[model samples]
Target chain A: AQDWQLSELLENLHADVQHKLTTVRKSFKHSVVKGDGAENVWVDLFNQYLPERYRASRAFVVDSENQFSEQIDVVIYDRQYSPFIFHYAEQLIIPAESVYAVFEVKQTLNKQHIDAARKKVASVRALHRTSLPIPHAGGVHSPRELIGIIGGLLTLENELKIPDTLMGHLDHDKADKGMLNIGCAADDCFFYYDNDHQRMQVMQHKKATTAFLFELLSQLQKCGTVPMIDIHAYGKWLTP
Target chain B: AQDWQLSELLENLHADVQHKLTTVRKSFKHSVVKGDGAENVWVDLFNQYLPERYRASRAFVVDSENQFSEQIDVVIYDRQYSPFIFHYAEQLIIPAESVYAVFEVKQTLNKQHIDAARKKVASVRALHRTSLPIPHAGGVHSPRELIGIIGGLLTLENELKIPDTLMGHLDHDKADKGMLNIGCAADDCFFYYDNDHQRMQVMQHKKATTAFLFELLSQLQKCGTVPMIDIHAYGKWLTP
Candidate 1:
């Protein structure tokens, strides 16, 4: 009798979780029918669920001088330290130095979409950023070389049979800029790089968005605060 | 009688040149009254006056693999060798390998504008490009370091007093990418970097457009043909 009761409870819990997943999926689909709906959904996932210190928005990243990166679909950056140049009602312009991660949002994941995402990532990583040593009580702590900015792509579904094509496009070479480090297709699977092993891994799963969220947050936590911005470079715009 | 005839011919030539200059200025102003007129005027000058071997359009240059430069006001590139991705009704997307020069168009020349041009130039120069050596019967000719995409600006008037501010913003350091090499203000003057002397020079003249045309063609003649494109990098997009 006890075994039957436990089994029944477990089944109910499974059904509850499945129902919640379906709700999220339905919401994504509902919004995606409108243009820019997918981007909005991805932004909401970060903006509403992530820690208060981090903010997500559509933005163009600029360096201290005159260099501006391509306009990004979703920019996950530090709000506590960065000053933004506002544009076209609600769109923000961020400095590359203060940016933590960037992602591209799409309704479907395909070869063409992957190539487009790679190009977008390249645009951001191509800009120049600076990091300086921090002063401490005991000794001056020199910062390590600036790590590659976390780049990703989010989609509703994966249409490709062999997902390895997506992994192959990522920047495995540390020498190259704009490496795609992670991606998730809501209905398909999760893709991420193992920094320690220096190789990409794919997890084919049903609860893709859930898995992606957990991994993305973990990566952001590891990245810590963004580097200091070179304010003087932007100050030149003020001069005659 | 011979001296009288020569003077009469000289007077007629000067009047005709003045009439042509006035007509060009009028067309530029007519367009400038509408938005993007200055940019359109500059594009027309290149498309109409440059040799058939070259084509001019507003474009963003991309290198094979993942690098794309910022959108340029005018891209002067080889039509014979480059494959263009057309956009809108008229804009062209050029590859960095086939691009020879790029320019920013402005209504006025000022410190702010110069810095903006410098930033635009830097964005393009920062992208990576590859060139392979050429083989011949006599010997192999090693490819020279890819020359910086000749950066320039076109403007209607100079807002600054001495015009030294215009020249001062030029990147004299060879180590820096996207140095402003030349500029022309339709009704005012022409600015150019002297590669021989390694200094910026400005010529204040009434025939500003004619002087600009002469010097620009001369510079293009010296630049020779663009380097070969890296097709393999771009071919990856075509593969499954």
Candidate 2:
């Protein structure tokens, strides 16, 4: 009779714990959202509220002080690591698990306008000339770096419409489901296409649940640090 | 006195005419945006509204409905004018001016999502296994088609951030006043770049405000109809 009573109590406790865990996850997701620019309010907010385990140091990588020369948007680094030079691009080295924030930032979220933006992006990529994240030695490729792109709905909507054929070339875990949506339309709204998933998975939040959003953002940010397998694995310096 | 009077009358007439022109242009722009698909919208809009002088038959050239095939977007035939192909890809073809519409279309307005969306785009470009855009005639050479890309902020925001160096590659007919913030920010909004005289050239409206943008799109769409100069112009070909 005592054993039976104990089993019932433990089962109830397990159910209660799962419910609490889901609630806690919901709380963090509520914080993610599109914030204002040049050190936004959310940055401060996130810094303050995020658990100690989630926080890290971040810096913008610029080629030169002049904004026009070249620049990389905000780069968050793992507390345990430092920046590294891979194939000439100044990359912030971080643990795959430590990256909990990633954003593909732009001046605005208009395609016609952003093509102008892409010219800049392509320019920086060209000038920086990063090798694929794969490594050269031991023929051992590292795990793919997971990246999170946080922005308004306008930024996220375009990915869904891309023709399927082209979607194949992109190296990603998967098109995330939780991260997908149009400009600020949904919170906790993000898409995920994991390495294992063929199609994008979306976990859309219908309301402005910043905490849910933030949690998703945080989760993705952590993925950004996944070690790259092929950092321009093979190349030779040309002799002049 | 008579000459002065005539001049004043001419000036007033010019102002009145300008007002009417603006109204007409506004109506035209709105009319074109009603459609759904990008290429369809482009063709319907251009054919329905472009000046009769510039009006040409729209050609839809699909290599294969399999979007994975390198099908032609749209080609405009202008009564025996020089053929221009608008191929949106990196390492564009030469003699850039031949391109009428340098469109870099995104799946949507979101900036960050474009790159992710472009995974499909790359596959679309890949449909053409052969680098040659034009055909070979009698086993001889032909003029290589000129191609370039047009991108915008939509893709940059959500899909991928533009690298700073790549900014130089784009034809930013208008740029900001040495302020990356203003330049990058204005990339979404139709505000003029703070830098030069061309600052006034911002294409704020959907119906292309700039003649250059309009011309480029129209011209490239026309490439579908123009026969390849000849396959010989291409140094490389994959012959099964």
Candidate 3:
């Protein structure tokens, strides 16, 4: 009997990103639940696209000093080495050494979201990160330099629905400038890529997700890998 | 000074696929190298999206009988459950219980490619897979049903730009029916999501990749988790 004809599949995917995220807005009535609703989509996107060696989670980053960062929306970190995960119920806390990138998911891109995002980004980046020398297949390898943690934002829509909404808020400060490294608003976002080649610019919509995804991966590639964690240092907290 | 304004990231992503795969057709001059070239793209795609629990690879699936399937292009299998991997340098071999899905990648979709695809897909699907009862906190659970592995074709272009090229070829058969279950050609493909609700259908292009990707994931989800592997079953092969 004939059975195989057709069955399966989304649009620009970014638009579907909004489509799938339809509930995020509804959940916003309850602020905390709303963040979770939105957090999942970003988490799914990163897990689906980024390298297999790295994984994303909604967790807090803590230092050996026992200081913990504000709970982050999306933490992109190593899955191989630094194998320490502090799981106390649903609240997960991983050492700062395991983190490679962190993100905040919001419904709108506004001054408030930006402020919150900056605080969240800095929370992890500012944590004490330690790298240690390692033994390898060869002789003892020297400790590698630390990779700068990537911090960014992912929002459903823009407050003003214009690039100005974001542009107007980033202050001209010599400090705290790197607080937010990269981000995208599903409604409206920017694609600021460097090209030493000839001029080529085209119109795009519902494309912010695609552009942001590729851009995020490009930035992540530069971050190299998470530094080898000084596990013994973290073990210092094992109380006597 | 202000630093956070813009610094980023595809169009529909499907087009970028062919664009990124420009070298695939070129690599055809050397057959093996060409397959490896195209294999990496699909590997990257599956690893990038689809739940983190499943992983994709270019490997052979082996059953307890020591029978190994032909080297497949992309094998989407368990990442957590089946920890056993037989690694002999570059060639990777995994137990049939570890595999969730497999795909054959090609430059153009034609009769020959489809034939090769069908043969390759059948190789893994026909292998004997074993499942065992597992122990859990509550109680010992009974053995679960084995998931039907997914198989499909992925190609850069179509022999004939019309869907008839594929439609005309799939013959009526009582058996060996599921050999090529789902697939996509970058040039043209179908979106066959079922609807019991209101009517809705849309036109999309250069979107085959995105559509194919989501479709694959949807199918993979229904396959459920890989059943518990009988380590002793595989251990038998350890003897002379």
Candidate 4:
């Protein structure tokens, strides 16, 4: 193929892949989970470092456009479900069975951030409970279709330590609810800590966040459990 | 040499060769006749759409610490004279020479944005004047060192249409001033432009701004006009 043609092909291929991949990824409930239903550890954590603006913006979305545009903590892009997502009067999408992985981004790497992350996953899980399962073959039709949620924290010098409590929460119902955590040994993804191996790999990868997210997604995708996700930020959700 | 030694040698040698080439080239400057300073219609055309933020940032750097820290737009890194860039009344150091170059950066591309690039460069020229003559090399005293003062725009788009005025500016001064403008075209040096054959060649060897600046410094070193320089953003210089 000509060089120019190859360039064009690559560009188009990227777009096409992104479209489908985004669709799969966007099928879950995303939340920054805080407040009353949340654990005190999480509430303290969220309040300590979480930006007020981000939380406020999420609240607005949940309260106002929650039904049709319920893209809380999740971003969706599958053209297959575009009609459903775009036209649905009540915005609702599950991430596990019909969706991809959920992302948890935090600005701080403090323990409080970890608590906040837990609340977010819990919030997503709660909202995901309302999803109706799919009817298609090899598909779930239950309102709750979520399988896994991934949390990540950002810091330059601090490492995101996967606390035992956080791990326990995800593993509490591993046979039922799926959740995972990947913490960088250093702020940002300068190093990846493999707890099982006690080996810390200096992250030579250029895009650490993307690479880690993909790794988490790869693991979840292997489970074959279809996660129902909303694939958007919290403010877009229509229901609680 | 061992593998590690060989790697270091290769890296250093590559840098050395590049340095010498730049020095040789920097010795040559365009001797503009009175009223014949470098100006391009394309530069003018492009500047009309310059972003207000770009103008403000550049203008703000006329003097003073940009972010409450010592951050100067232009830096002169001459080995002969110690720059009193960060001196106090108690302890006098080197003084900072004023050298300015204007250019816009386009994180995304639209024709309108590219068109506004030239004005950014022109504004720099209009606001600042470089009256310092080319340094002279004496047997004992080295030539007064001047850093490379570059002016150009950057775009993230894969393809860009550089106006003829830019081409004209380079072509007009290619012989007298060995100013290098590399990588002005599309991705991996592929830009399809409808321009004169000679003009196209001038635009062909375009380089990224940072890399080009380094190349210019290397050329200066080759011409035995190597001036030591410090490349640091604001707040960084105070640390060490």
Candidate 5:
């Protein structure tokens, strides 16, 4: 009686465990697809929404001071103004002076995810960027002020039970240097801190992510164009 | 007095004639555009209307009998059934047996254009075609009878004062072998001879070209797929 019972139980337990392990492997692989797919989702969003002059890419940003930021998920910068883009096989590197915005991508939004995103944004902002006199068809002019490097986070959903907690995290107590300007929890809602009005805004709808993307366009328009990058400063590395 | 009168008339006539001549040059060049552009007009028409199996191209058709037709504007043939397609730089050549439909592109339609298209249609029909039994996932089947090669013309507009003249031309007095099946004068209307109903039909509308394309697809549906071409027959030239 014990032999039959133990044998039956073993068979049942082993079969369930085997199926469960197989599913776990598939889920691990599927999560990776979602991450890569999410990158494409926002990549296409920027391509469709923004005009051609501003290029968005996954890249690393380095400043004139020789400090480099972590690999960024979405880097929106000017190609016409900052044409020097370095390539290393699958990776891309752009000068921090060219960077107008940077973002972090994750599967789920949490306190740590936002905190980690803040650090990522801070790394790029911390780099010492240089500006120079501008040259144009009209004539040479004085150097323009360096525009703020926009920062944000993107995730599938909010991990917290109460999404209102997001507003507090976005409202950074520190100076505005590492402040998250905009972000989206794609499946739930998108949030943006209005620099103009000094407020955190969240709108939840079926197409909340798209609305955020549209808002991103408006924010980019306000940023105008990145100051013509000091390519020679970057070229200094080429010196003997 | 005569000089004064002549100068006044001459200046007016010359000024008006100069503008008219300028318009004539533009119209002439525009007609050339229509011919090349008509190829695109119908090419797109075919692409949007038909599925992937029926590959359309501007190609010449050759038969085992060493006969070749003139450069066809739009040649709809089988890619799978007759896989061997010859290319000479920009031009393409396929076996006559592979041809499902042939269309003549023109800027304007008249008696001569229709007659010319008929001859073009006759060239492909005259060529001998050989078919073999097809292999499939299930099993091999008996040799299927050869389906008729479709022939038609495409033009920008009818040159005639009345469009009804198109019907009689499509009603070919010759044998069914060289018979014109369908044609479209893109701007005004399109015409097709219904072999099953034994009648000529014309439909005129703003989107008459698209309607003709849709009908062409239905006619292709009736013709079904082309027979399996005997590549060995074409390969005979390689035999030493």
Candidate 6:
């Protein structure tokens, strides 16, 4: 009943994630784009940590109708149904319906930073999206309910107590669809919207990075995959 | 703390809203188009109950980039800041930035109906939107956060327990920005997303219609007006 073997493995994995994040933090000093450093590091971290089915990068979420969300700091999208990635002006442009989750990378977690994240998430959520019902062996599966986009923030630290301030900000934007659902501070704190209780819950521990990683993975797993994008819908954006 | 006078006035107003909705429901039987009847009725209902600052109609939410959401059943948008409403082929096309809310009308509150409403909401939410920092009396109030598009469903009755079923549907679409924030079942019950608690709360009194009307009005009051549309952004969609 008590097995340290699995525990040790997980412990090592957590340490690895933490070390990688630390490396990303240290490398930020070398970035050329004054503001791109945090974003670039987060994209790299997510790309490195997540599995092959997912791809993380700085991208814009677009749908067939020529609608696009604001530039995203890190886009975690499904590669399988994404068709092909479009590189527009050296920036990644993805189909809106293909995005699974998105993150805003910040140097610190604060009121301003969280507000920015919420705004960013709002931009993406405001775009037009399409999801068609999937045909399965049995009767057609109702187009899976469009799940909420997993919006989050990744930062090095928090200047104040995590949940209290963070929850207040979330409450202010409570009516906003773009509210951040998850957040991670590199050192020893993270928070997530406990969907079950509809409240923000914080987890602070020495293994904060590891805890954040697993919690995110669990949510992602339950999220299934981004529904197929309806490409024909984009035709309206084109000129005859 | 006890002001029954104002309460009585609101109660009468609620009764009026309920009667109108019931009349619309009864009139729906003559609708020739498979769906236009419900939509037209809802648009008429909102127009009647809501204030002058808002214009309710069947419209498409278009962004500065020329992208548009799916044809919304009823678009309750701001008329003051909206430069001009486009009437193309008899369809009202509105700037995405100027929309306050949208709703889907259905005969019953069932899974399929809710799913359709969610999909419609997703289309609107997935569009790219822009907001400039507003210059106010005192130092500028940052262009107010792009509020979440108020999404909802209007129906005559619930196939099952009103709150439980509706809440389940809202939770399912929680991540997709497709969650319904408001819903009204003409004669029996209604519900609203209580942002403070982040939960769907139901109100089922004999005056459910009246309750729904006041609650919606209260929410719209705080929602204020839609942001100004970013016109230059839409230039790309137009050919010189």
- What tens digits encode model 5's per-residue C-alpha lDDT throughout A137-191? 9999888788777888877666753557767666774365678888877567788
Clashing pairs in 3: A8-B192, A48-B48, A48-B49, A49-B48, A211-B9, A215-B9
User: Tens digit of lDDT per residue, candidate 6, span A1-240?
Assistant: 857798789888877776666655665555564444567766776787787777888987776645567788998886543433554445677767777788888777787888889888888888777776764324566666665678998887776565566567655343477777788877768888787877777777677777887788877877666664454354222222
Chain B TM-score in each of the candidates: 0.80, 0.32, 0.81, 0.34, 0.78, 0.85
User: After superposing candidate 5, which stretches have Cα over 4 Å from the reference?
Assistant: A1-38, A135-140, A161-163, B1-240
Better of 4 and 5 by TM-score: 5
Rank ordering of all candidates by TM-score, starting from the highest: 5, 3, 6, 1, 4, 2
lDDT of 5: 0.71
Docking class of 6: incorrect
- Candidate 2: residue B224 Cα off by (Å): 76
User: Which numbered prediction scores highest in DockQ against the true structure?
Assistant: 4
lDDT of 4 by residue, B96-209 (tens): 223323345443334554445534433333332112334447534443454344444443333434645434443424222223233232221222212345342423333333
Interface RMSD of each: 14.9, 19.9, 17.7, 21.6, 45.1, 24.2
Q: Pick the candidate with the highest TM-score.
A: 5
lDDT of 2: 0.32
Please write out the lDDT profile of model 3 over residues A165-204, one tens digit for every residue. Answer: 4455643232352456667776566432233422212213
| Model 6, CA-based lDDT | 0.71
Candidate 2 chain B: minimum summed lDDT over ten consecutive residues — where?
B177-186
Per-residue CA lDDT of model 1 for A18-123, tens digit only, reads: 4444433554455322332346556766786688988898777877656777668899887787655544222357888777888887767787877777788788
Which sections of candidate 4 miss by over 4 Å?
A: A1-79, A82-99, A128-146, A151-179, A183-207, A223-240, B1-240
DockQ each candidate and list the results. 0.01, 0.01, 0.01, 0.02, 0.01, 0.01
RMSD of each: 21.0, 24.9, 23.6, 21.3, 22.7, 23.2
B213 Cα displacement, candidate 6 (Å): 49
lDDT of 4 at B190: 21
